[PDB]
Scaffold this active site. Structure first.
Site, short mmCIF file in Angstrom:
data_model
loop_
_atom_site.label_atom_id
_atom_site.label_comp_id
_atom_site.label_asym_id
_atom_site.label_seq_id
_atom_site.Cartn_x
_atom_site.Cartn_y
_atom_site.Cartn_z
N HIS A 240 15.34 5.27 -7.17
CA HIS A 240 15.13 4.67 -5.86
C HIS A 240 14.43 3.40 -5.69
O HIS A 240 14.35 2.67 -5.01
CB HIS A 240 14.20 5.42 -4.94
CG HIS A 240 12.86 5.76 -5.30
ND1 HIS A 240 11.83 4.95 -4.85
CD2 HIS A 240 12.15 6.79 -5.74
CE1 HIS A 240 10.80 5.42 -5.15
NE2 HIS A 240 10.78 6.52 -5.87
N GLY B 97 3.27 3.22 -4.85
CA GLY B 97 3.13 2.35 -6.16
C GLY B 97 3.03 3.06 -7.57
O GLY B 97 3.30 2.69 -8.79
N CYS C 174 5.14 5.92 -8.28
CA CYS C 174 6.29 6.19 -8.51
C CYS C 174 6.95 5.83 -9.98
O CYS C 174 6.48 4.61 -10.31
CB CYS C 174 7.49 5.76 -7.58
SG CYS C 174 7.11 6.56 -5.79
C1 LIG Z 1 5.82 8.83 2.03
N1 LIG Z 1 6.56 7.89 2.82
C2 LIG Z 1 6.99 8.48 4.23
C3 LIG Z 1 6.19 8.15 5.48
O1 LIG Z 1 6.73 7.76 6.33
S1 LIG Z 1 7.03 6.58 2.17
O2 LIG Z 1 5.89 5.74 1.79
O3 LIG Z 1 7.85 6.06 3.23
N2 LIG Z 1 7.93 6.99 0.93
C4 LIG Z 1 9.36 7.55 1.39
C5 LIG Z 1 10.01 7.93 0.16
C6 LIG Z 1 11.02 8.67 0.26
C7 LIG Z 1 11.82 9.25 -0.84
C8 LIG Z 1 11.30 8.91 -1.94
CL1 LIG Z 1 12.23 9.59 -3.44
C9 LIG Z 1 10.28 7.97 -2.17
C10 LIG Z 1 9.68 7.49 -1.10
C11 LIG Z 1 8.28 6.77 -1.34
C12 LIG Z 1 7.08 7.98 -1.66
O4 LIG Z 1 7.23 9.00 -1.30
N3 LIG Z 1 6.08 7.02 -2.25
C13 LIG Z 1 4.90 7.61 -2.83
C14 LIG Z 1 4.85 8.32 -3.83
N4 LIG Z 1 3.67 9.02 -4.28
C15 LIG Z 1 2.47 8.89 -3.24
C16 LIG Z 1 2.56 8.45 -2.35
C17 LIG Z 1 1.36 8.40 -1.36
C18 LIG Z 1 1.24 7.56 -0.37
C19 LIG Z 1 2.45 6.77 -0.03
C20 LIG Z 1 3.55 6.84 -0.29
C21 LIG Z 1 3.80 7.53 -1.89
C22 LIG Z 1 8.15 5.93 -0.16
#
Ligand SMILES: CN(CCO)S(=O)(=O)N1Cc2ccc(Cl)cc2[C@H](C(=O)Nc2cncc3ccccc23)C1
Ligand SMILES: CN(CCO)S(=O)(=O)N1Cc2ccc(Cl)cc2[C@H](C(=O)Nc2cncc3ccccc23)C1
Ligand SMILES: [Cl-]
Lengths: 305, 305
Positions: free
Chosen positions: A41, A143, A145
């Site tokens: 991603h 960040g 990931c």
């Molecule tokens: C969580 N999100 C949705 C909120 O409307 S996001 O930040 O847009 N998001 C969407 C998303 C979707 C699919 C996949 Cl594979 C990765 C992601 C990203 C994601 O999961 N990253 C994060 C990973 N771990 C902890 C995280 C704590 C906090 C923030 C983000 C984290 C980015």
């Protein structure tokens, strides 16, 4: 004496962490030999996440679109390929700090150490377990990931998890190092929810044996149970079914303490019924399920107090 | 999201661990530049430990009596001296993996990471706190002596603890890296006991702020309290007194959540007088005191090293 949630020393993994950048997205990568492994991603925008076509997004990229940074050094990408949900970036330099390693896929109930990273820089290390619903209760921010989960039994690092996403309940989902997700999750922003979670019964039992080893027996009783009767009771408290494999795996701890597995199962049934009544077990007022039978044998003394 | 007991990455410390042997006793040492630091009780036999005159035991030793092993390499001892309860062994080779470091003495309530070692080999890493009674609730078996406690500030390792002994209640005692014990303990086989312990109030408050940051707000109330009234209640429940310095230190967390420190003190007062009533806070049924205000900010902000 004592019993702590202990993680493996993270040094062998710290020497593999790198920063991967694709356009405006920055996340972590694992540099082993001449390949950097990271979540696929990294090539997506926030809009792309609804229904991304990774093959279509990747075909439009060249090696020089991926920026890889190891400490203060820029690595040169000489190739790229996708394997399931992991992107593999071939680089021109082999990591001189590459430890002895294997990629292993774990089962629910298994524990591992997580080295949480941001911008290719390690920030902390903690111990956790693969929940029965295939999620992990981690501590991760945006960040993180690409951060990895591992075990270091002997001198070999066994990589078992790479962080991909946070689900709506605050729990985390990811893949093995071959890019296959744990659980029915997809690297896509869709209505995905963790299934109902359960307690890892074999781990709670192992932790009760660790308490006996360290010198505490207040929770034992004069009763035994059949495996079927224990499971009928256990499933009413959202505990995972205990199988004959689990009973077999607890054999060494049963022989070291002198308490049969089904005898310990009877203590567990009674703890679920009565609660702790103001008491603690190894400094905890809840029944702990993130220590496997193997972790207990590794941390506890071979001589029961 | 998520909140874990997180330790600093241990890599910079792993590269300093060595095995020290004197006669029949084997323990761990810290190799920094051309000096190996280890507990001075490495020179004692079981009988010597009863009433040891360390200068008299040390005068009878030569450099070659101390065997130092770094991985599979034997280090040559060229000098030896004692500073308080630490033995300093001058070796012929400077550690090429010596990180940027300082020796710092911590205060009760402060936390640190422990890299537990056996035979100069690191086995695990965990986070813990210096209790108000100067003991640490660690996880150590025989052979752990010489294992160290540390924090990382930017790229500098601050060594604050070296393990020396286990008390009858299973808790642990040790020194700073200058050999001064934490607490009224001495390094010998004699009747010693940990004093009555108390809860680190400023740390419980910080952990309540971390729970609010993570969405756990059931314990918040409309009430406030004076600092004097809070301390009168806190003294009744074996909690350490909360000072104006503690209130000042919690300022940033109070501004991030919009909950004044004395407002959070009113929530803590109600939890102490009523319990949790079947509820948990960050997956715990007890009030957690091993996260400092700085640990809460660092974990909820993603600080890297
Ligand atoms: C969580 N999100 C949705 C909120 O409307 S996001 O930040 O847009 N998001 C969407 C998303 C979707 C699919 C996949 Cl594979 C990765 C992601 C990203 C994601 O999961 N990253 C994060 C990973 N771990 C902890 C995280 C704590 C906090 C923030 C983000 C984290 C980015
Ligand atoms: C009485 N002993 C065990 C105390 O429960 S002992 O093994 O004889 N003991 C005596 C003794 C006395 C003074 C000093 Cl400074 C060190 C020691 C040694 C000591 O404390 N080492 C240990 C440290 N940590 C965990 C330990 C778990 C188990 C055993 C030993 C441990 C060795
Ligand atoms: Cl497994």
């Amino acid at each position: 004496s004592g019993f702590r949630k202990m993680a493996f020393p993270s040094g062998k993994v710290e020497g593999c962490m790198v920063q991967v950048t694709c356009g405006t997205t920055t996340l972590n990568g694992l540099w082993l030999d001449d390949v950097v492994y990271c979540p696929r991603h990294v090539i997506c925008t926030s809009e792309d996440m609804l229904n991304p076509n990774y093959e279509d997004l990747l075909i439009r990229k060249s090696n020089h679109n991926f920026l890889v940074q190891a400490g203060n050094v820029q690595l040169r990408v000489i190739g790229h390929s996708m394997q399931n949900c992991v992107l593999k970036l071939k680089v021109d330099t082999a990591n001189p700090k590459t430890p002895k390693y294997k990629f292993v896929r774990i089962q629910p109930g298994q524990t591992f150490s997580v080295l949480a990273c941001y911008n290719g820089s390690p920030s902390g290390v903690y111990q956790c377990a693969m929940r029965p619903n295939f999620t992990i209760k981690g501590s991760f921010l945006n960040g993180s990931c690409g951060s990895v989960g591992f075990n270091i039994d002997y001198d070999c690092v066994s990589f078992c998890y790479m962080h991909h996403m946070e689900l709506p309940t605050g729990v985390h989902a990811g893949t093995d190092l071959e890019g296959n997700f744990y659980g029915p999750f997809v690297d896509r922003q869709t209505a995905q929810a963790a299934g109902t979670d359960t307690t890892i019964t074999v781990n709670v039992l192992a932790w009760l044996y660790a308490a006996v080893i360290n010198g505490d027996r207040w929770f034992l009783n004069r009763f035994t149970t059949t495996l079927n009767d224990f499971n009928l009771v256990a499933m009413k408290y959202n505990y995972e079914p205990l199988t004959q494999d689990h009973v077999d795996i607890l054999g060494p701890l049963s022989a070291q303490t002198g308490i049969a597995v089904l005898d310990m199962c009877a203590s567990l049934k009674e703890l679920l019924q009565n609660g702790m009544n103001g008491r603690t077990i190894l400094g905890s007022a809840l029944l702990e399920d993130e220590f496997t039978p193997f972790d207990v044998v590794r941390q506890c003394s071979g001589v029961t107090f």
